[PDB]
Amino acid sequence: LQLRPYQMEVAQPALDGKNIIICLPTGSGKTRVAVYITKDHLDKKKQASESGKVIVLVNKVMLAEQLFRKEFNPYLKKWYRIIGLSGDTQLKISFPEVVKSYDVIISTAQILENSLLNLESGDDDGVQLSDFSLIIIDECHHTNKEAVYNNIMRRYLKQKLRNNDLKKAIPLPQILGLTASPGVGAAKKQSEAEKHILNICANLDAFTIKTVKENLGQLKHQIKEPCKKFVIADDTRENPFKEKLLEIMASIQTYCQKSPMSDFGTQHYEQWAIQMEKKAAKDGNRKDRVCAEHLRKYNEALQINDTIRMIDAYSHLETFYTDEKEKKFAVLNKLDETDEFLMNLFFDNKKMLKKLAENPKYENEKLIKLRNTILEQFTRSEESSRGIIFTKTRQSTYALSQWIMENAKFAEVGVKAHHLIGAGHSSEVKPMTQTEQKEVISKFRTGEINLLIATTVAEEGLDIKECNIVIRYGLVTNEIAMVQARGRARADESTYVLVTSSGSGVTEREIVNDFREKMMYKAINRVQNMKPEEYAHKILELQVQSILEKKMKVKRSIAKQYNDNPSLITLLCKNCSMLVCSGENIHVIEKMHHVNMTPEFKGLYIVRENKALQKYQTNGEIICKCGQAWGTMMVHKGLDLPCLKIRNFVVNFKNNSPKKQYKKWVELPIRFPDLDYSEYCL
């Protein structure tokens, strides 16, 4: 391993105690300086006949294996014992034991917290911090309100104050936080920015920050920025299509007699639709809820029209209504006035909308703008042409990847592309899998795919190859994502683009984040130069406040919903105001999943085979006689006992009918019994 000049000075105080933060720019060899500090710490503790164990904490899964392979092991294999843990191994099981070996640990975080609370909650073996001598951390800036990793530090600080009260002593470990930039936490003033920085430092018990200042030219030579750049467009033609939908929506409303006091093709209208649907369901009146459920889809279509072709929205709707018709046919294998009206309204115009949509006279501006942007680069760079795109949603990524596959020009210049999204199981999309992710990464590094379409998945963690033409298509989250994307584009003649519309404040937000970036550095300078006694005073104050801010939160959130009422309810279908179950019939398996195993509920529903699995069905999706999907099948002990949700059902209390929607099971107070085969058997 090698020791750079400017990494030296930033590392220097850490080498003799002095828990600190380190914020350097991106790509400056953050991991490597980490590694060096490790080796020093361990060699030191050996030379003093003192036990030395380091643990690394990360926030994602992949970074653990990542760093295990590339940085720590290749250099420290010979002197020491290393290991890499995560939720994707089998070494989680005896975590207290691996500590008894493996002086170097890498780990996903919540592993640790789980073990601590097992030591402090059950009679399990567990572990305490005393068994360490260092904690190295990545991505400092997640240390905020009740994240994971702040439990850890709140406990560290609790024990530190125990030590301090003792002094007026357990040897606490050293801490070393590493980041790119800690970031201003939503503050409108330089002073509150400062306050936030100090809040971080108190949550890390730091002594400084140690930005690089002295050996700065070596950085500028070795490391450089891209060039910021904007591209803007405007649209007032909306020629055939938009109005063609607004007509429909207006017709539905004037069938429903509901006044939005709002506009078509925005987000407040959506919120209204939601609460209206919820109200209609808590009351039970159809004709309003179901129309709302459709209007939401129409609004979504319009929103994506603002960014994406008409064809994609038409397809979105086609999928929706095709599904609904298939549902009604599987059930009927009756036709209420509502659904009949809605379908008759839609399908008559289906062919029209298909014609209107395919119309290259007025496709979209931003797509053309990025056409120009992209072609410029891939003509300039010629086979060293790595690319990245960022957007907001998943569907957008699929659409763009599809298009770039379709249009010939992109394929002509060698614009090989692939999409990328996150693995969360929610949000009406089939997510990806970690394997797919890693493979795409390796293809990019290989060069199979020249450019990637991504959500916010890329602006952290996983290690993409350096790039040229990072852009930004309808997304401005905050300064952190801004800088982290800004730190990708090496390979000179790099850029950082933003593509937006005119009448949607985004460039606004871009500038705000730019100012925030310029602000935080000022604050850093304010604090680095702060006097040590004053600094100490303030961090002590903040640590106290943080710990007291814990206790209170503890005193008001013990249970907050504890009234266990077994069968005091009735679950109805939310589309059709129809009984489905009572609370007694339901049971739980593994104290997590809810399920019912009475033949009454058995006969009520229908199974529609899966589309996720065709991409032999195993987990069937349940539907009603109305058509409302309810749940999913399940295989427990071979019993195909069908699970369900509480997002599609409505509750009715027996007393006075405040019917409520809950969106998940933990929110409600009442408890359900565990499953046992004594019922239905013996």
Place this chain on the structure above:
RNA sequence: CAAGCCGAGGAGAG
């Protein structure tokens, strides 16, 4: 590989 439970953070709009 599919299904689901819980928790956390960020952003928008209200």
Place this chain on the structure above:
RNA sequence: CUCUCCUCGGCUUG
């Protein structure tokens, strides 16, 4: 404070 979008982590059934 609520809704939506986005990401992440831990954990179970198969």
